[PDB]
DNA sequence: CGTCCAATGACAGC
DNA sequence: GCTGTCATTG
């Protein structure tokens, strides 16, 4: 009962036996064998990997029980030349693709990355039910550290730890078979992983059943990984010319601000050095000392802090947005455009999806700069960095967002009749909040003030104190306390929900979302008042924000299911590359924004996808409050117009 | 000693 | 070599 590797591509008879057994397995694990070219004498043939030089996919290991790993060589020549590589890739695709009535699940560590490699390198598109142990580890503890192969074996299969004795890459987040840096062969690494991943998943599936989270794992979380896989293969269009255009006009404003600021100070100073800013603003002037955004917003009434704040916003866009975007862009010759390919991250505390390298979610909102014209000398020009994100030639960006998703969930749980009343009016909650605060007409509220009222809204709802609220509103703490107390007197059901949530969390030790995902907050019983209250606010926010993330995932999964139904074309822009012209059809998931789904849709399918997206988002889950969706389309992420 | 939540990511002065 | 702070987004 020791580790046995059966090289199935060595004998035609042994291969056909392997294909015979594999085709009747309803559960198996696979691990891609990736290896780096470390010596020309030992260099193995295989399929090259995009973005990696000297790294190839040499094979693939399959395990369906015990410590027997079946290694499937993807090299150009086998021990039996009658079994050509083309014959092997045929059987490989035949077994990794299922029929309608057939039911079969494949267990893969780091499924999204493996799905992309098989498609872009080996030309294999998986058509099975997917299970990833990394996702199962996250469902049991969303605040856990990102799982490694070593930690999974340490916690769910500890007897097989000596198998990972010499391989230090098992203690890395990357898969053992994908980490070609190890001096071990990809054949041994993939075979080891196949055995550890298959048996560990049976233990994880048992725990998920006992936690009543296996349905969420199979019907929501894993299909959401498949959707993000298509997103990572699609990427988001990027227009270097537009981004450079903004970099030029933004740098012109910075030059104008610097000149205008040097006149106000009587000399030249460096905006980077806070010492030079501190000497001017305080030692050279009459401003109350004790350069922070909070400090400079207080001192915003001579015009120098305002000019310093603007200089630091624009500089942040150039240095921390323009620079990474221009770096991570690459050419897609199959679409004739430049695209940015970010990486999805679903191991979050509440279940939200963020992205990395680069995090296109953090691309700045539209902001105005004033530049001298022939008349105004301060003419407003909008700087929309999202305008640089464009669809393929002949398509449009489709954005569909939930209208106050978290508030509707909060109404669903608190049953606060005043909140249900506010949502049913159809008026913007945040403009009304700003309309009473500033005593202005609602139609006059600008986005800056509306954003300020938005943070005042969710802040007060999620436990903000009077001191911070007074800092936000520029009023005294005692005056801000009236606004909080007035909120608690108006919306009593919300407060009753907050009280009930904290009480149950203190007893249960956790809080649950609508789908049943548990987040464990042991600080709910902490003695430290700060750490205790932070846990109390986490308990209330996780239920609402996490349930909002559940609804968006279900809608994404439901949308993509409908899209593949109508359009027999390529699932993703990676299926066009991995399979090698043909016109683009359908809509392509490009970005998720917590409450918004971004889609790159071809013109002839804009109406059809829009109907699909709106209907599926509105019927994701059934709530006591209706889920309202607004669909926008436009030639860019920054030129979205309302679509009926 | 720090009281809206979630997130990525560049720096710093411990 | 960093934990913390602080830009930005939701
Ligand atoms: O009630 C809201 C706002 C509000 C409305 C709706 C919601 C909802 F629907 F999302 F639940 C939440 C809020 C709040 F921000 F407080 F959380 N006040 C309360 C008040 C008042 C007041 C006092 C003297 C004179 N005039 N007016 C608010 C709080 C801070 C700034 C401005 C107004
Ligand atoms: N706790 C907290 N949650 C926030 C904050 N900003 C946003 N969120 C959460 C609540 C709703 C969700 C989506 O944010 P949006 O910016 O889309 O808010 P929105 O109400 O949809 O605004 P809009 O209708 O203008 O899109 O993110 C904040 O400042 N604090
Ligand atoms: Mg929104």
XYZ file of C-alpha atoms (C1' of nucleotides) and ligand atoms in Angstrom:
732
model
C 0.000 0.000 0.000
C 2.864 2.350 -0.881
C 3.079 5.151 -3.434
C 2.856 3.568 -6.893
C 3.098 5.547 -10.138
C 1.689 3.704 -13.162
C 2.919 5.335 -16.381
C -0.117 4.624 -18.548
C 1.343 6.037 -21.791
C 4.083 3.372 -21.872
C 1.969 0.511 -23.273
C -1.037 0.570 -25.596
C -2.551 -2.315 -23.628
C -1.889 -0.571 -20.308
C -3.248 2.686 -21.745
C -6.530 1.172 -22.935
C -6.915 -0.464 -19.521
C -6.448 2.953 -17.912
C -8.964 4.605 -20.247
C -11.414 1.781 -19.516
C -11.230 2.289 -15.744
C -11.120 6.091 -15.944
C -14.317 6.307 -18.004
C -16.391 4.642 -15.255
C -15.013 6.758 -12.392
C -17.483 9.383 -11.178
C -14.852 10.951 -8.886
C -11.153 11.463 -9.555
C -8.354 13.945 -8.927
C -5.896 15.398 -11.432
C -2.666 17.350 -10.978
C -0.812 19.035 -13.831
C 2.857 18.045 -14.079
C 4.752 21.259 -14.832
C 8.543 21.211 -15.050
C 11.251 23.757 -15.808
C 14.035 23.190 -18.339
C 16.926 22.878 -15.870
C 19.403 20.901 -18.008
C 19.399 20.335 -21.763
C 20.167 16.643 -21.216
C 17.090 16.131 -19.003
C 14.850 18.631 -20.813
C 11.489 17.017 -21.541
C 9.228 17.857 -24.456
C 5.767 19.196 -23.739
C 3.325 22.050 -24.169
C 4.781 25.480 -23.299
C 3.113 27.655 -20.668
C 2.087 31.238 -21.376
C 3.952 33.837 -19.340
C 6.657 31.319 -18.375
C 9.952 30.762 -20.180
C 11.629 27.329 -20.012
C 8.548 25.973 -18.180
C 6.507 23.274 -19.928
C 3.609 20.947 -19.131
C 5.212 17.508 -19.307
C 2.288 15.400 -18.108
C -0.665 14.885 -15.803
C -1.393 12.573 -12.863
C -4.790 11.005 -12.128
C -5.881 9.379 -8.858
C -9.246 7.816 -7.996
C -8.396 5.963 -4.779
C -5.621 4.758 -2.499
C -1.976 5.628 -3.108
C -2.006 4.620 -6.797
C -1.283 7.565 -9.102
C -1.662 7.128 -12.864
C 0.747 9.392 -14.752
C -0.320 10.571 -18.223
C 2.691 11.702 -20.252
C 2.086 14.657 -22.586
C 5.503 14.422 -24.244
C 5.830 14.306 -28.021
C 7.042 10.682 -28.037
C 6.022 7.733 -25.862
C 7.583 4.363 -25.099
C 4.980 2.885 -27.471
C 5.105 4.903 -30.728
C 1.760 3.404 -31.788
C 0.189 5.660 -29.124
C 0.780 9.026 -30.767
C 0.495 12.292 -28.861
C -2.595 13.145 -30.911
C -4.178 9.856 -29.836
C -3.388 10.652 -26.195
C -4.811 14.181 -26.361
C -7.982 12.700 -27.865
C -8.531 10.288 -24.972
C -7.498 12.988 -22.498
C -10.194 15.314 -23.838
C -12.735 12.487 -24.099
C -12.335 11.650 -20.406
C -12.232 15.266 -19.170
C -15.542 16.000 -20.953
C -18.894 14.641 -19.790
C -22.315 14.081 -21.324
C -25.594 15.533 -20.056
C -26.958 12.575 -18.082
C -23.500 11.471 -16.912
C -22.408 12.773 -13.502
C -18.723 13.116 -12.645
C -16.628 15.354 -10.379
C -12.920 16.159 -10.745
C -10.876 17.285 -7.726
C -8.145 19.822 -8.546
C -5.973 21.927 -6.246
C -5.972 25.533 -7.501
C -8.620 24.728 -10.095
C -8.705 28.138 -11.797
C -4.995 28.097 -12.640
C -5.143 24.454 -13.746
C -8.214 25.136 -15.904
C -6.354 27.939 -17.685
C -3.173 25.926 -18.285
C -5.032 22.926 -19.721
C -6.876 25.255 -22.102
C -4.161 27.695 -23.188
C -1.265 25.195 -23.216
C -2.690 21.703 -23.800
C -5.844 22.855 -25.600
C -8.152 20.947 -23.230
C -11.392 22.502 -21.959
C -12.674 20.779 -18.824
C -16.389 19.921 -18.902
C -16.938 18.379 -15.465
C -18.069 19.260 -11.959
C -15.196 20.877 -10.084
C -14.003 20.568 -6.486
C -11.071 22.596 -5.136
C -9.781 21.859 -1.602
C -8.690 25.501 -1.272
C -12.346 26.545 -1.520
C -13.477 23.878 0.957
C -10.884 25.088 3.474
C -12.202 28.637 3.067
C -15.839 27.638 3.637
C -14.919 26.097 7.005
C -13.160 29.308 8.155
C -13.183 32.384 5.872
C -10.683 34.124 8.182
C -8.196 31.250 7.908
C -4.829 31.743 6.265
C -4.711 30.890 2.578
C -4.322 27.096 2.482
C -1.215 25.304 1.280
C -0.805 21.670 0.289
C 1.213 21.123 3.469
C -1.442 22.682 5.718
C -4.219 20.618 4.114
C -2.280 17.389 4.631
C -1.342 18.582 8.130
C -4.997 19.158 9.042
C -6.906 16.558 6.987
C -4.488 13.714 6.125
C -1.658 13.902 8.682
C -0.403 10.332 8.215
C 0.836 11.167 4.698
C 3.006 14.064 5.910
C 6.263 12.079 5.340
C 5.372 12.048 1.626
C 5.927 15.833 1.678
C 9.125 15.561 3.739
C 11.660 16.681 1.138
C 9.435 18.909 -1.015
C 9.399 22.400 0.500
C 7.116 23.685 -2.277
C 4.229 21.885 -0.547
C 4.357 24.733 1.997
C 3.661 27.263 -0.773
C 0.231 28.428 -1.901
C 0.985 27.237 -5.439
C 0.182 23.661 -6.432
C 2.921 21.060 -6.047
C 2.660 19.998 -9.687
C 2.474 23.564 -10.997
C 5.509 24.780 -9.009
C 8.201 23.910 -11.554
C 10.867 25.464 -9.313
C 11.203 22.271 -7.280
C 14.176 20.058 -8.094
C 11.756 17.117 -7.956
C 10.354 15.824 -11.230
C 6.946 17.031 -12.341
C 5.982 13.368 -12.640
C 6.667 12.763 -8.944
C 5.157 16.074 -7.804
C 1.921 15.631 -9.758
C 1.604 11.994 -8.677
C 2.103 12.912 -5.011
C -0.418 15.748 -5.278
C -3.063 13.608 -6.999
C -3.012 11.163 -4.078
C -2.966 13.783 -1.326
C -5.636 15.939 -2.976
C -8.044 13.077 -3.703
C -8.018 11.599 -0.196
C -7.992 14.997 1.523
C -11.090 16.011 -0.440
C -13.045 13.019 0.879
C -12.330 14.263 4.405
C -13.253 17.837 3.471
C -16.489 16.634 1.866
C -17.370 14.847 5.115
C -16.800 17.988 7.192
C -18.811 20.089 4.729
C -21.740 17.682 5.085
C -21.582 17.958 8.883
C -21.532 21.762 8.529
C -24.359 21.730 5.937
C -22.125 23.664 3.532
C -21.646 21.034 0.813
C -24.574 22.422 -1.198
C -23.096 25.929 -1.054
C -19.766 24.398 -2.086
C -21.168 22.550 -5.109
C -23.923 24.928 -6.266
C -22.382 28.358 -5.572
C -18.721 28.516 -4.571
C -17.162 26.070 -7.042
C -19.288 27.252 -10.018
C -18.263 30.788 -9.036
C -14.646 29.653 -9.456
C -15.459 28.434 -12.971
C -16.938 31.852 -13.760
C -13.839 33.648 -12.482
C -11.720 31.267 -14.570
C -13.518 32.487 -17.692
C -13.001 36.040 -16.416
C -9.248 35.544 -16.010
C -9.058 34.034 -19.500
C -11.038 36.975 -20.905
C -9.186 39.854 -19.267
C -10.422 43.435 -19.663
C -9.727 45.602 -22.690
C -7.262 48.434 -22.188
C -6.537 51.509 -24.321
C -2.934 52.669 -23.910
C -3.676 55.825 -25.908
C -6.538 56.851 -23.616
C -4.544 56.138 -20.449
C -1.546 58.109 -21.721
C -3.844 60.973 -22.734
C -5.092 61.233 -19.150
C -1.539 60.958 -17.804
C -0.631 64.028 -19.876
C -3.582 66.217 -18.873
C -3.182 65.119 -15.242
C 0.519 66.011 -15.242
C -0.383 69.396 -16.736
C -2.687 70.087 -13.786
C 0.072 69.013 -11.385
C 2.409 71.500 -13.065
C -0.284 74.174 -12.747
C -0.951 73.312 -9.092
C 2.765 73.411 -8.268
C 3.174 76.826 -9.909
C 0.036 78.104 -8.178
C 1.210 76.652 -4.857
C 4.693 78.175 -5.118
C 3.110 81.609 -5.560
C 1.032 81.121 -2.400
C 4.146 80.144 -0.419
C 6.457 82.730 -2.013
C 9.010 80.020 -2.851
C 9.304 76.530 -4.326
C 8.678 73.519 -2.087
C 8.596 69.762 -2.636
C 5.149 68.183 -2.304
C 6.771 64.822 -1.523
C 8.675 66.127 1.519
C 6.239 66.749 4.372
C 9.028 68.682 6.109
C 8.913 71.290 3.341
C 5.110 71.286 3.605
C 5.238 71.577 7.401
C 7.683 74.495 7.269
C 5.455 76.425 4.858
C 1.998 75.666 6.249
C 2.928 76.297 9.898
C 6.374 77.851 10.396
C 5.896 80.308 7.505
C 2.159 80.946 8.006
C -0.506 81.291 10.712
C -2.202 77.881 10.762
C -2.996 75.760 13.845
C -0.306 73.071 14.111
C -1.341 69.538 15.079
C 0.442 66.921 6.728
C -2.499 64.510 6.919
C -5.582 64.365 4.718
C -7.546 64.834 7.942
C -5.198 67.640 9.014
C -5.264 69.381 5.633
C -9.044 69.067 5.304
C -9.337 70.896 8.631
C -6.935 73.622 7.441
C -8.824 73.979 4.126
C -10.085 77.464 5.087
C -5.358 79.730 2.774
C -5.958 77.749 -0.483
C -2.670 75.831 -0.123
C -3.988 72.676 1.656
C -6.657 72.354 -1.034
C -3.959 72.540 -3.703
C -1.845 70.028 -1.770
C -4.766 67.607 -1.436
C -5.499 67.801 -5.167
C -1.815 67.327 -6.029
C -1.737 64.150 -3.938
C -4.931 62.723 -5.456
C -3.713 63.160 -9.036
C -0.210 61.934 -8.191
C -1.772 58.823 -6.649
C -3.567 58.170 -9.944
C -0.407 58.535 -12.033
C 1.954 56.614 -9.752
C -0.407 53.953 -8.360
C -2.957 53.502 -11.178
C -1.517 54.637 -14.521
C 1.862 53.022 -13.850
C 0.618 49.504 -12.916
C -2.029 49.496 -15.662
C 0.501 50.426 -18.349
C 2.843 47.748 -16.965
C 0.367 44.847 -16.818
C -1.111 45.469 -20.274
C -0.331 42.921 -22.970
C -1.339 42.245 -26.557
C -4.126 39.857 -27.560
C -3.528 39.188 -31.283
C -6.709 37.111 -31.605
C -8.757 40.232 -30.783
C -6.397 42.893 -32.149
C -6.270 44.868 -28.903
C -4.479 45.267 -25.581
C -6.003 43.643 -22.506
C -5.259 43.530 -18.783
C -5.410 40.074 -17.180
C -6.044 40.280 -13.413
C -6.209 37.362 -10.982
C -9.343 36.653 -8.956
C -9.170 36.351 -5.163
C -12.094 34.653 -3.417
C -10.461 33.832 -0.052
C -12.067 36.813 1.664
C -13.623 37.261 5.092
C -17.192 37.944 3.941
C -17.238 36.129 0.589
C -16.626 39.115 -1.677
C -14.482 38.727 -4.787
C -11.499 41.028 -5.233
C -8.785 40.979 -7.890
C -4.993 41.234 -7.849
C -2.165 42.142 -10.240
C -3.608 44.705 -10.818
C -6.732 45.315 -8.678
C -8.892 46.951 -11.337
C -11.604 47.441 -8.698
C -9.515 50.242 -7.152
C -9.468 52.246 -10.406
C -10.474 55.779 -9.341
C -13.934 57.240 -9.765
C -14.395 60.101 -12.203
C -13.039 63.363 -10.801
C -12.920 66.910 -12.145
C -9.861 69.063 -12.753
C -10.020 72.755 -13.610
C -7.777 73.889 -16.455
C -7.454 77.374 -17.983
C -9.530 77.870 -21.124
C -10.156 80.941 -23.267
C -12.982 82.031 -20.931
C -13.263 80.122 -17.647
C -9.600 79.897 -16.535
C -11.011 77.052 -14.402
C -13.031 75.018 -16.885
C -14.105 71.640 -15.436
C -12.664 68.645 -17.283
C -13.606 65.135 -16.165
C -10.815 62.589 -15.674
C -12.377 59.133 -16.070
C -9.725 56.443 -15.698
C -12.355 53.766 -16.359
C -12.704 55.266 -19.855
C -9.410 53.530 -20.711
C -11.109 50.129 -20.300
C -12.790 49.404 -23.634
C -14.507 46.463 -25.348
C -13.253 44.569 -28.372
C -13.683 46.323 -31.750
C -17.398 45.951 -32.429
C -18.647 45.436 -28.873
C -19.891 47.290 -25.800
C -19.385 47.231 -22.042
C -22.524 46.150 -20.178
C -22.745 47.001 -16.473
C -25.575 45.664 -14.310
C -25.663 46.611 -10.629
C -28.032 45.929 -7.758
C -29.827 49.003 -6.401
C -28.818 49.176 -2.718
C -28.365 45.431 -2.316
C -27.149 45.589 1.286
C -30.017 47.854 2.371
C -32.591 45.471 0.884
C -30.977 42.538 2.696
C -30.985 44.582 5.913
C -34.687 45.263 5.348
C -35.237 41.542 4.722
C -33.707 40.612 8.092
C -34.714 43.548 10.314
C -38.212 43.929 8.803
C -37.769 47.647 9.523
C -40.926 49.132 8.024
C -39.321 52.573 7.717
C -36.434 51.128 5.687
C -38.864 49.191 3.480
C -40.714 52.496 3.123
C -37.556 54.375 2.099
C -36.570 51.811 -0.539
C -40.056 51.765 -2.101
C -40.100 55.511 -2.832
C -37.570 55.172 -5.650
C -35.655 58.276 -4.542
C -31.918 58.184 -3.901
C -31.330 57.534 -0.199
C -27.986 59.342 -0.293
C -29.263 62.501 -1.989
C -32.060 62.738 0.585
C -29.531 62.320 3.401
C -27.418 65.093 1.883
C -30.578 67.122 1.225
C -31.427 67.253 4.937
C -27.849 67.636 6.191
C -26.998 70.597 3.941
C -30.628 71.783 3.561
C -30.405 71.857 -0.236
C -32.508 70.610 -3.124
C -31.964 66.879 -3.791
C -31.204 67.500 -7.476
C -28.272 69.728 -6.427
C -26.305 67.032 -4.566
C -23.006 66.419 -6.330
C -21.242 63.074 -6.393
C -18.658 64.235 -3.845
C -21.376 65.121 -1.337
C -23.400 62.040 -2.288
C -20.344 59.875 -1.603
C -19.910 61.665 1.724
C -23.527 60.891 2.630
C -22.975 57.300 1.472
C -20.183 56.805 4.014
C -22.349 58.548 6.616
C -25.140 56.099 5.777
C -23.289 52.773 5.896
C -21.058 54.098 8.673
C -23.918 54.838 11.067
C -25.594 51.553 10.110
C -22.399 49.570 10.774
C -21.583 51.049 14.180
C -19.787 54.350 13.583
C -19.415 56.476 16.697
C -20.329 60.115 17.179
C -16.694 61.259 17.223
C -15.938 59.808 13.787
C -19.334 60.952 12.492
C -18.640 64.477 13.722
C -15.266 64.301 11.993
C -17.078 63.212 8.826
C -19.711 65.961 9.055
C -17.481 68.734 10.408
C -19.647 69.075 13.529
C -19.192 68.527 17.246
C -19.343 65.023 18.690
C -22.382 65.897 20.815
C -24.155 67.261 17.733
C -23.231 64.135 15.767
C -24.608 61.979 18.591
C -28.056 63.457 17.939
C -27.900 62.262 14.327
C -27.085 58.736 15.514
C -29.798 58.810 18.182
C -32.286 60.241 15.681
C -31.388 57.369 13.345
C -31.954 54.835 16.132
C -35.341 56.359 16.985
C -36.517 56.331 13.355
C -35.230 52.870 12.366
C -35.893 50.707 15.418
C -36.108 47.397 13.553
C -32.547 47.812 12.293
C -31.358 48.462 15.851
C -33.348 45.483 17.140
C -31.669 43.376 14.453
C -28.259 44.687 15.522
C -29.046 43.818 19.147
C -30.315 40.340 18.255
C -27.312 39.696 15.997
C -24.765 40.516 18.709
C -26.581 38.405 21.313
C -26.726 35.312 19.097
C -23.121 35.741 17.946
C -21.968 35.909 21.571
C -23.733 32.591 22.213
C -23.009 30.782 18.939
C -19.506 32.181 18.471
C -20.280 32.876 14.804
C -22.693 34.520 12.384
C -24.255 33.014 9.268
C -25.133 34.400 5.854
C -28.370 33.570 4.037
C -26.720 30.544 2.403
C -25.350 29.233 5.719
C -21.684 30.241 5.506
C -20.269 30.756 8.998
C -17.708 33.378 9.971
C -16.213 32.756 13.409
C -15.716 35.904 15.517
C -14.246 34.812 18.873
C -13.616 38.450 19.816
C -17.339 38.821 20.554
C -16.556 37.817 24.166
C -13.243 39.679 24.460
C -12.555 41.805 27.531
C -10.879 44.635 25.605
C -13.731 47.036 24.724
C -12.155 47.953 21.379
C -11.607 44.363 20.240
C -15.066 43.457 21.558
C -16.950 46.219 19.729
C -14.979 45.590 16.530
C -16.205 41.994 16.704
C -19.763 43.173 17.401
C -19.694 45.359 14.286
C -18.128 42.521 12.278
C -21.029 40.254 13.255
C -23.643 42.660 11.887
C -21.706 43.637 8.758
C -20.696 40.090 7.787
C -24.325 38.934 7.672
C -25.378 41.753 5.341
C -22.240 42.109 3.218
C -21.670 38.356 3.037
C -25.262 37.716 1.979
C -24.792 40.393 -0.683
C -21.761 38.474 -1.952
C -23.766 35.236 -1.995
C -26.482 36.789 -4.172
C -23.953 38.177 -6.660
C -22.190 34.814 -6.994
C -25.487 32.992 -7.567
C -26.429 35.559 -10.213
C -23.043 35.208 -11.930
C -23.396 31.415 -12.000
C -26.983 31.713 -13.244
C -26.065 34.265 -15.932
C -23.144 32.265 -17.342
C -25.344 29.163 -17.485
C -27.831 31.034 -19.682
C -25.086 32.523 -21.867
C -23.614 29.132 -22.797
C -27.136 27.930 -23.648
C -27.867 30.443 -26.406
C -24.369 30.896 -27.850
C -22.515 27.839 -29.146
C -19.493 30.085 -29.799
C -16.340 30.191 -27.674
C -16.955 30.276 -23.925
C -14.135 32.765 -23.341
C -11.475 34.700 -25.202
C -9.157 31.951 -23.959
C -11.081 29.265 -25.829
C -10.422 31.270 -28.996
C -6.708 31.337 -28.127
C -6.421 27.795 -26.762
C -8.195 26.354 -29.814
C -7.029 28.865 -32.477
C -11.177 34.460 -38.169
C -14.545 33.676 -36.539
C -16.674 36.635 -35.380
C -17.142 37.323 -31.681
C -20.568 36.512 -30.248
C -22.152 36.664 -26.813
C -21.113 38.369 -23.613
C -17.916 37.887 -21.632
C -17.540 38.276 -17.862
C -14.722 40.790 -17.376
C -15.120 42.296 -13.898
C -17.147 41.975 -10.692
C -17.654 45.020 -8.467
C -19.266 43.579 -5.311
C -22.724 44.865 -6.314
C -22.101 45.141 -10.070
C -21.287 42.732 -12.900
C -19.276 44.016 -15.864
C -19.709 42.332 -19.247
C -18.103 42.699 -22.671
C -20.949 41.986 -25.101
C -21.033 41.974 -28.893
C -23.421 44.469 -30.467
C -25.841 41.903 -31.913
C -26.149 40.317 -28.443
C -26.380 43.465 -26.286
C -30.168 43.270 -25.965
C -30.198 39.506 -25.391
C -27.451 39.532 -22.754
C -29.025 42.555 -21.046
C -32.320 40.678 -20.709
C -30.451 37.600 -19.458
C -28.426 39.527 -16.880
C -31.317 41.586 -15.490
C -33.671 38.614 -15.139
C -31.076 36.341 -13.522
C -29.826 39.004 -11.104
C -33.372 39.869 -10.000
C -34.300 36.208 -9.363
C -31.060 34.969 -7.763
C -32.604 34.589 -4.293
C -36.148 35.195 -3.061
C -36.392 38.002 -0.500
C -39.265 39.838 1.155
C -37.946 42.965 -0.617
C -37.666 43.050 -4.402
C -34.180 43.114 -5.925
C -33.962 45.974 -8.435
C -31.277 46.036 -11.136
C -30.106 48.823 -13.457
C -28.443 47.852 -16.751
C -26.044 50.266 -18.456
C -24.152 49.966 -21.745
C -21.483 52.110 -23.349
C -18.289 52.213 -25.372
C -16.204 52.080 -22.170
C -16.365 51.492 -18.431
C -16.512 55.292 -18.083
C -19.104 56.009 -20.809
C -21.970 53.857 -19.520
C -25.445 55.069 -20.488
C -28.706 53.768 -19.052
C -30.153 50.854 -21.031
C -33.840 49.956 -20.843
C -5.535 52.951 24.633
C -6.881 51.642 19.270
C -14.395 52.024 18.301
C -18.340 51.709 10.238
C -17.226 46.916 7.169
C -14.650 44.658 3.128
C -10.390 44.784 -0.171
C -5.334 45.589 -2.757
C -0.880 47.699 -2.554
C 3.198 51.042 -1.761
C 6.179 52.407 1.466
C 8.569 53.250 6.448
C 11.026 53.857 11.038
C 10.520 50.212 14.059
C 12.895 42.320 7.106
C 9.291 44.205 8.016
C 3.953 45.389 10.798
C 1.669 49.575 10.410
C -0.222 53.499 8.039
C -2.771 55.244 4.393
C -3.608 56.171 -0.564
C -7.841 54.007 -3.454
C -12.292 51.025 -4.437
C -16.851 48.795 -3.036
O -31.888 59.399 9.389
C -30.844 59.915 9.004
C -30.241 59.411 7.669
C -30.523 58.014 7.143
C -31.603 57.767 6.335
C -31.911 56.505 5.831
C -31.109 55.410 6.150
C -31.468 54.032 5.588
F -32.584 53.963 4.875
F -30.517 53.483 4.790
F -31.626 53.060 6.544
C -29.989 55.612 6.986
C -29.707 56.902 7.477
C -28.466 57.071 8.387
F -27.430 57.718 7.800
F -28.622 57.701 9.562
F -27.943 55.874 8.725
N -30.275 60.912 9.821
C -30.888 61.368 11.087
C -31.213 62.777 11.318
C -31.465 63.910 11.483
C -31.773 65.288 11.673
C -31.341 65.990 12.809
C -31.685 67.350 12.925
C -32.438 67.922 11.896
N -32.820 67.162 10.815
N -32.515 65.935 10.702
C -29.004 61.612 9.447
C -27.777 61.253 10.041
C -26.575 61.886 9.709
C -26.531 62.910 8.763
C -27.728 63.281 8.160
C -28.932 62.645 8.494
N -19.411 49.777 5.610
C -19.324 50.393 4.406
N -19.828 49.758 3.321
C -19.770 50.325 2.094
C -19.151 51.648 1.952
N -19.225 51.971 0.647
C -19.841 50.942 0.008
N -20.162 49.962 0.874
C -20.849 48.692 0.541
C -22.347 48.887 0.718
C -22.948 48.709 -0.664
C -21.841 48.093 -1.505
C -21.816 48.760 -2.870
O -21.343 50.094 -2.706
P -21.764 51.216 -3.776
O -20.674 52.259 -3.830
O -22.203 50.533 -5.049
O -23.013 51.867 -2.993
P -24.454 52.089 -3.671
O -25.429 52.310 -2.540
O -24.747 51.010 -4.684
O -24.217 53.493 -4.423
P -24.725 53.733 -5.929
O -26.208 53.455 -5.863
O -24.377 55.177 -6.198
O -23.931 52.738 -6.744
O -20.613 48.357 -0.827
C -18.622 52.280 3.183
O -18.078 53.406 3.145
N -18.744 51.607 4.335
Mg -24.247 50.341 -6.394
